[PDB]
Amino acid sequence: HMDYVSIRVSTLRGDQKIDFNAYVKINDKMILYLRRGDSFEGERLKRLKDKKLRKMYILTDEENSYRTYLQKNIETAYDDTTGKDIQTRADIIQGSQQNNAEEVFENPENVESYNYCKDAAGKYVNFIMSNAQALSAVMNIENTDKTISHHGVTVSTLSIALAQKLGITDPKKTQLLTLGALLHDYGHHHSPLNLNQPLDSMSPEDLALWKKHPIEGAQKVQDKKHFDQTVINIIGQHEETINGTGPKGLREKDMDPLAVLVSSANAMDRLITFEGVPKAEAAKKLMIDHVGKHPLQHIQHLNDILKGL
């Protein structure tokens, strides 16, 4: 009898108490999981981790409560005047960025959703740039379920920090870099590929499928008038390497410089998140197993960023 609407689980973050139930779908039935009054700050977030949760459901009659919950979370989290714990702010903002990316992946023709994601990417740059511990707090949020939207947020975070180290200050460029990084793996959306394995031990079939993703991703968006060219370039070129060994065979001179940055940042998170490489060993691995693929200055800066420098 009752109607439900879907919500993305990355929107359930921080210490605000929910004024709605939330349900997990099991065997196509809506099973009560989160109750009115629950919150998700600190260790409470574990209730939503390691469970491959993507969508949950709320009663349609409670949708207004959810919408107000989300808007309050976002407004409070981006506010630099509150003195709110940085980890809680980061929990909310990381999840909101992920939500915005998922909305674009699910609705790529939607101009408003793209523009919302773009505007929020600008807000994200400002959050990371204006709060000393923001990057560290975001990097504390492990990608337990190995999703491409969480991975996009992580890659965008490393990309913002890398851009700062390289002296790329133009706000339009940093916004588009962040947006492209967030969306970079659109080509993997609803792919049967298990990303959580090393590329060099994938079956030939899996590797072949993997090589298609930037090409397919870019082809899908390249003629959409509302997509920024830089974002299209990042989606399509982010697997390219400076010595021309990537899927498109591009060399550094052939590439959007911002895609070179995302390529480096991505290569690092792939090692750490998808291949189980300890963060302190990732730079070495790229240099010794990914010879000549990325600019040494990017790898050194990324190593420093992961070290807190």
Ligand SMILES: [Fe+3]
């Ligand atoms: Fe990729």
Ligand SMILES: [Fe+3]
């Ligand atoms: Fe990636």
